[PDB]
């Protein structure tokens, strides 16, 4: 008995939370093994992991199985509003266009799905970007503070206060441009490709199936991640200030001084994020099936 929007918001949020918490121990072990040398350097670890199974036996055996979900609450407080806004807005923009595959032509309908995905991504980003910046600032200040380094902020509000006072709204949305281009591509292909391919391939007994929905979302996230990766290279590279003027000069100078290949480097890692995203989409549809 709530609006059509708030329902999607809550469905997207819940589905995002379930998806993140589900894929949490795999990402935990992935990080643990990937960043073990830097831990030996900082004195956080004493000897390497002679295997993924040993990494499990080790961490879980000392502090319990729950140790696998360390740091997940922060990822859920980041991811919940992000995906909630994304899904609610996708269905809204989809209804704003309101294309019927049969009434308006398949290519125009798919363009409707892609446009909706992109628009929703851009809107969510506009709302959550400053929060991501502030949480990051506070976390880095906490690490420096942990090691005896001088503190800069009391809390999030202090981050907002100080950054607003020095650079204004631009300070909070620092490096927004390549961020919104990348997200309009990524969310466009994410929502657009999933919704456009789902009725085509998932027909008959697969119309209500979940494993099929997750696998389709898995492909979609894989491909979309790969397609949106160069804008992520330009984004990360431009926010590295914490060397280039405008994303177009960063693009041209990187392609000319490193190569086109350099932009794509680091693409393989997205593979686990690909699971999370995929799970959010499938769990969402399933969640709507039981709801309506």
């Amino acid at each position, epitope marked *: 008995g709530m609006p059509p929007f708030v329902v999607d918001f809550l469905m997207g949020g819940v589905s995002a939370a379930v998806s993140k918490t589900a894929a949490a121990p795999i990402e935990r072990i992935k990080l643990l093994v990937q960043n073990q040398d830097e831990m030996i350097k900082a*004195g956080r670890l004493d000897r390497r992991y002679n295997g993924i199974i040993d990494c499990f036996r080790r961490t879980t055996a000392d502090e319990g199985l729950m140790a696998l979900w360390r740091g997940n609450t922060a990822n859920v407080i980041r991811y919940f509003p992000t995906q909630a806004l994304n899904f609610a807005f996708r269905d809204k923009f989809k209804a704003m266009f309101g294309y019927k595959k049969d009434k308006d032509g398949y290519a125009k309908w798919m363009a409707g799905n892609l446009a909706s995905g992109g628009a929703a991504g851009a809107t969510s980003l506009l709302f959550v970007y400053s929060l991501d910046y502030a949480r990051t600032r506070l976390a880095n200040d906490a690490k420096s503070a942990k090691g005896g380094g001088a503190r800069q902020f009391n809390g999030l509000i202090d981050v907002y206060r100080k950054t607003l006072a020095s650079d204004g709204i631009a300070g909070l949305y620092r490096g927004f441009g390549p961020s919104v281009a990348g997200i309009v591509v990524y969310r466009g292909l994410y929502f657009g490709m999933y919704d456009s391919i789902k009725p085509v391939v998932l027909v008959g007994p697969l119309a209500n199936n979940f494993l099929a929905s997750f696998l389709l979302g898995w492909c979609v996230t894989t491909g979309a991640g790969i397609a949106s990766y160069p804008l992520d290279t330009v984004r990360r590279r431009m926010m590295m200030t914490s060397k280039y003027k405008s994303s177009i000069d960063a693009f041209r100078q990187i392609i000319a001084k490193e190569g086109v290949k350099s932009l794509f480097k680091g693409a393989g890692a997205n593979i686990l994020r690909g699971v999370a995203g995929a799970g959010v989409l499938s769990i969402y549809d399933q969640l709507k099936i039981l709801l309506f």
Partner: nanobody, 124 residues
């Protein structure tokens, strides 16, 4: 129950060499990383070195690189620290620590058991 008792160390001339011992009682020694630290009055404590439980890998600090050499004996349950080419600034109370092998800790100063330390004074 578990005690870390520092052995060796006294007053020595500059440039001479010392060996400090660390006797660990009450625990499985063949499974604990041993660490060496020092504390001098007016100076914040600093981590010297660390050695794995099986005596496979050793790690040092930039301040005592190549000068100090850490080792251990599981048959005697002792950790050794060899101090060479000493300078007057090395004058400190050297203490010993121990922690389980392969547990992730917040940093260098996070250990299970701590010793009380042996005074080391370097004359000029």
């Amino acid at each position: 129950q578990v005690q870390l008792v520092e052995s060796g160390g006294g007053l020595v001339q500059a440039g001479d060499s010392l060996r400090l011992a660390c006797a660990a009682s009450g625990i499985t020694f063949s499974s604990y990383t041993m660490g060496w630290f020092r504390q001098a009055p007016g100076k914040e404590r600093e981590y010297i070195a660390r050695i794995t439980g099986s005596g496979s890998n050793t790690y040092y600090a930039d301040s005592v690189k190549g000068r100090y050499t850490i080792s251990r004996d599981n048959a005697k349950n002792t950790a050794y620290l060899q101090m060479n080419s000493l300078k007057p600034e090395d004058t400190a109370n050297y203490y010993c620590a121990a922690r389980d092998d392969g547990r992730m800790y917040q940093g260098f100063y996070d250990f299970e058991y701590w010793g009380q330390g042996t005074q080391v004074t370097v004359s000029s």
